[PDB]
């Protein structure tokens, strides 16, 4: 029953069966590398990948720095037997952890079932293996045997934390996206992981740790395994499909390459950035590709290169693609079976869903970028278990994701140098000197991934404006934990394809990795001259670096940006002079006690309101914290919110384009009562679909263009609060170390207590801030986006009402007996709006509970 049914040690002797030196497809001539077959169809090679790609042979940092927020290099990693033993055991342990969830059991079983198609022949009656979907397995005597293979885990290339799914291409076939599939090579390391900031789960866990949390490498591996799943079933989305961004404005990223394949694979909100028109186009495309597989199987008459029979190989692919087969042996694609398989491969197998099964903390969107690299070691059971990961049951690490908190669980995480420098990729934002008073420009560098995601309009498409033909026939059209259990129940575990004998290939298998779209470097260091302080200036103003003297808080953004010993606070002037005052030893602890009170009072303030649609609270200090709406005061912010609504938060106003909706053309059947009536009912049903489509489109637009903005403001509000805590800490601490080491011995001061209290107050603040910003997001949706939709939908309703009433009149002869009933039906149905229910379009119990 375990996925890995054998203990593997790197120094174990070879047997040519599941422990062996192997050769994989290679462009030149690769040396055999020791590998381990940890499960049918799945191998692990504990080596750095200097093999799959001829250019990437050097393990040193590149000439030009890679355009990613976090990268890590060490040419010595994974060069020793002990490291390779630890790698192997870590990967093996992560497979069992994935397998130990229902979802992973399914995914891993789909992967094993998803053998690359036998489309190696050019004759359309012959099945034949494709060479590059195989390996050569060296025997203990020095001979070799060739074997088919679905998946290989290998060590990373130069950039140790660049994890990706690679695959050998074909001169004619695009195997990863034509339904065929190909053997997948995942660059991965269990020995490092990413660190990220999270502040959302603070309402459920008010005791959430300060600082960075570590990504569970099981989530990371599951992510790459999802990719490998898509690619094995040959339904990956071409990487030339990218969600392109606007990069011109001062507040926008300089560049961002995120593929549709990645959005799909993440799941959650990210997957919904892709509109319905593109979504359905994909599904239809892959459906036809599966149909081609069924058809080539139907005309297959022979098989070469194996003793395995034709009926056996056909069945292997009937099973992989869940084809139907009639009693004469003719294979076909069933629309319903395809839809379920495609839905499972792309919507059930997602990172988001894996995070639910693991019950770990994780970035909620790709836009919450990784911020650090950590060294880890998950092999020792005292560090990490198959069932609990880092969050070990019956310990203090069990709750609040404490095991993933790199500060609380610091022995498990060593923070490493990010080889992407802080301002390697940046924009230079300058408040024009005259604005500040002439006096110099106030220029700061802003890291690329601290800027805003502004999706290009071209990412969003629709055929709302197209008309359609209503017919008597016309066809009338969520992922829950229960649904996943229902899909789970269709799985037969135990039943896998055999490892069959194939004829030996060449000693060297010639292979080239799938041709990838070349990507341009972003422009870097672009300079902007601005007529205001930005959020970014207000945030930078709250920072400090290493220094010898006492930091002082100031309420002037300007002063703080000009003086390394001065830090901007949005707290009250009273707070400013209290923290800044010289404080004698005998009053130290009461002074600390008061500052914590004050810090808490200021950060937990909430104003209630009855004057803004769908916004019942306001956090007033958000105004001066980030200069929201370019109004430097709390009073300015509160009033500006009530006046203009949620828009003042936005860095940019989204385009929301709903065109005149296409008109329904009704077909007349002038000799048939039933058909005429069905046509009228169909028109009504299609109308109901139209509201749904319009709403769904607007939700997609809102999530990608508006909600992402509020998300970043939320992240930055947390950074601001942390900045305030750190500054207050540094000052309190400076004041302490001014005392005699006799005063200090009496005042047994523990800065850890201070940090813990301030973190708690930051969590409580973030609870309010998150509720507030949630309300703002939904309120903007409800009051500034959806109404454009409903107006267009009401125009359409009115137009449709006229058409249907005319249709009934023109067919009153045919509709003898029913004219008046059909009028009521049409009039009643098209008189009142279809209410928008957010829960129909998103399953975030967070944004849902706001609605």
């Amino acid at each position, epitope marked *: 029953m*375990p996925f890995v*049914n054998k203990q593997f040690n790197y120094k174990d002797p070879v047997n040519g069966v599941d422990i062996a030196y192997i050769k994989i497809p290679n462009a030149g001539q690769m040396q055999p590398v020791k590998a381990f077959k940890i499960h049918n169809k799945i191998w692990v090679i504990p080596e750095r990948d200097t093999f799959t790609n001829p250019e990437e042979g050097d393990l040193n940092p590149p000439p030009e720095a890679k355009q990613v927020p976090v990268s890590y290099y060490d040419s010595t990693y994974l060069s020793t037997d002990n490291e390779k033993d630890n790698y192997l055991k870590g990967v093996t342990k992560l497979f*069992e952890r994935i397998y130990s969830t229902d979802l992973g059991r399914m995914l891993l079983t789909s992967i094993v079932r998803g053998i690359p198609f036998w489309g190696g022949s050019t004759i359309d009656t012959e099945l034949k293996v494709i060479d590059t979907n195989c390996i050569n397995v060296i025997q203990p005597d020095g001979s070799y045997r060739s074997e088919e293979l679905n998946l290989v885990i290998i060590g990373p290339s130069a950039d140790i934390i660049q994890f990706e799914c690679k695959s050998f291409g074909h001169e004619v076939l695009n195997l990863t996206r034509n339904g065929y599939g190909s053997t997948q090579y995942i660059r991965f390391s269990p020995d490092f992981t990413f660190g990220f900031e999270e502040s959302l789960e603070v309402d459920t866990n008010p005791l959430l740790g300060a600082g960075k949390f570590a990504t569970d490498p099981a989530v990371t591996l599951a992510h790459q395994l999802i990719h490998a799943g898509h690619r094995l079933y040959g339904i990956a989305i071409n990487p030339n499909r990218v969600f392109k961004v606007n990069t011109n404005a001062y507040y926008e990223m300089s560049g961002l390459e995120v593929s549709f394949e990645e959005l799909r694979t993440f799941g959650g909100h990210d997957a919904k950035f892709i509109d319905s028109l593109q979504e359905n186009e994909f599904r239809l495309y892959y459906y036809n590709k599966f149909k081609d597989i069924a058809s080539t199987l139907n005309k297959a008459k022979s098989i070469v290169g194996t003793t395995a029979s034709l009926q056996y190989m056909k069945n292997v692919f009937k099973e992989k693609y869940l084809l139907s087969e009639d009693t004469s042996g003719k294979f076909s694609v069933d629309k319903l079976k395809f839809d379920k398989l495609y839905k499972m491969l792309t919507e059930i197998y997602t990172e988001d869903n894996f995070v639910k099964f693991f019950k770990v903390l994780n970035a909620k969107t790709f836009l919450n970028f990784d911020k650090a690299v950590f060294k880890i070691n998950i092999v020792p059971k*005292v560090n990490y*278990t198959i069932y609990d990961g880092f969050n070990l049951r*019956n310990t203090n690490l069990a709750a609040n994701f404490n095991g993933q908190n790199t500060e*609380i669980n610091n*022995m*498990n995480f060593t923070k490493l140098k990010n080889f992407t420098g802080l301002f390697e990729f940046y924009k230079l934002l300058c408040v024009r000197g005259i604005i500040t008073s002439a006096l110099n420009d106030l220029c700061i560098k802003v890291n690329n991934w601290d800027l805003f995601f502004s999706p290009s309009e071209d990412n969003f498409t629709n055929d709302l404006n197209k008309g359609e033909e209503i017919t008597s026939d016309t066809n009338i059209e969520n992922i829950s934990l229960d649904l996943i259990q229902q899909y789970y129940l269709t799985f037969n575990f135990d039943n896998e394809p055999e490892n069959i004998s194939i004829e030996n290939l060449s000693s060297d298998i010639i292979g080239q990795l799938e041709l990838m779209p070349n990507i341009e470097r972003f422009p870097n260091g672009k300079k902007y001259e601005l007529d205001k302080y930005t959020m970014f200036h207000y945030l930078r103003a709250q920072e400090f670096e290493h220094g010898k003297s006492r930091i002082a808080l100031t309420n002037s953004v300007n002063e703080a940006l000009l003086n390394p010993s001065r830090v901007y606070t949005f707290f009250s002037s009273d707070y400013v002079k209290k923290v800044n005052k010289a404080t004698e030893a005998a009053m130290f602890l009461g002074w600390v006690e008061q500052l914590v009170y004050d810090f808490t009072d200021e950060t937990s303030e909430v104003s209630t309101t009855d004057k803004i649609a769908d916004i019942t609270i306001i956090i007033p200090y958000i105004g001066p914290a980030l200069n929201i709406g370019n109004m430097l005061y709390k009073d300015d912010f509160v009033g500006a919110l009530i006046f203009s609504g949620a828009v003042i938060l936005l860095e940019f106003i989204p385009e929301i384009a709903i065109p005149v909706l296409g008109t329904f053309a009704l077909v007349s059947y002038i000799a048939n009562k039933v058909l005429t009536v069905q046509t009228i009912d169909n028109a009504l049903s299609k109308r109901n679909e139209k509201w749904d489509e319009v709403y769904k489109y607007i939700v997609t637009n809102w999530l990608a263009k508006v909600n992402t903005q509020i998300d970043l403001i939320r992240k930055k509000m947390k950074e601001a609060l942390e900045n305030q805590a750190e500054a207050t800490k540094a000052i309190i601490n400076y004041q302490y170390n001014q005392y005699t080491e006799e005063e200090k011995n009496n005042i047994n001061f523990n800065i850890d207590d201070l940090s813990s209290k301030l973190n708690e107050s930051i969590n409580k603040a973030m609870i309010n801030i998150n509720k507030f910003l949630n309300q703002c997001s939904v309120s903007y949706l409800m009051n500034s986006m959806i109404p454009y939709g409903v107006k267009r939908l009401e125009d359409f309703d009115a137009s449709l009402k006229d058409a249907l009433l005319k249709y009934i009149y023109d067919n009153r002869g045919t509709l003898i007996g029913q004219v008046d009933r059909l009028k009521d039906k049409v009039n009643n149905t098209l008189s009142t709006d279809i209410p928008f229910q957010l829960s129909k379009y998103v399953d975030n119990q967070r944004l849902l509970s706001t609605f």
Partner: nanobody
Framework: QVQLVESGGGLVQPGGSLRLSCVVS????????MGWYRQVPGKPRELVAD???????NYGGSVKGRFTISRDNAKNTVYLQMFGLKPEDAGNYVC??????????????????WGKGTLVTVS
């Protein structure tokens, strides 16, 4: 459930001596891979010594011959004789009952048993 109850922990002086013992409920004791782990606040458990079903022993790197682990199956009890105690030996000494589960151990999963521990403090 199965219970692990540790005794013998206390305040010891550098160079001093301690004998820890742990008794285990249930009937599976002879099956277990018994171990002693040390844990300090804010830090993971770390293996001090363990002993297999057959009585084979393994010691953490810092033991260096100073401790002896032993088991008495008849008393469902495991022992740790400690000599030459050092400040770095300080901590909560937690007994652990583990067993094989094929390729893995129960600990790796980990559904193995842990006591509340007996404190060791070094003067």
């Amino acid at each position: 459930q199965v219970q692990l109850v540790e005794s013998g922990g206390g305040l010891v002086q550098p160079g001093g001596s301690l004998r820890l013992s742990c008794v285990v409920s249930g009937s599976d004791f002879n099956t277990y891979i018994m171990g002693w782990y040390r844990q300090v606040p804010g830090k993971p458990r770390e293996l001090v010594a363990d002993i297999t079903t057959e009585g084979k022993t393994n010691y953490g790197g810092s033991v260096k011959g100073r401790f002896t682990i032993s088991r008495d199956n008849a008393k469902n009890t495991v022992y740790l004789q400690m000599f030459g105690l050092k400040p770095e030996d300080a901590g909560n000494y937690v007994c652990n009952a583990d067993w094989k589960m094929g390729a893995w151990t129960a600990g790796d999963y980990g559904i193995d048993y842990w006591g509340k521990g007996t404190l060791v403090t070094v003067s």
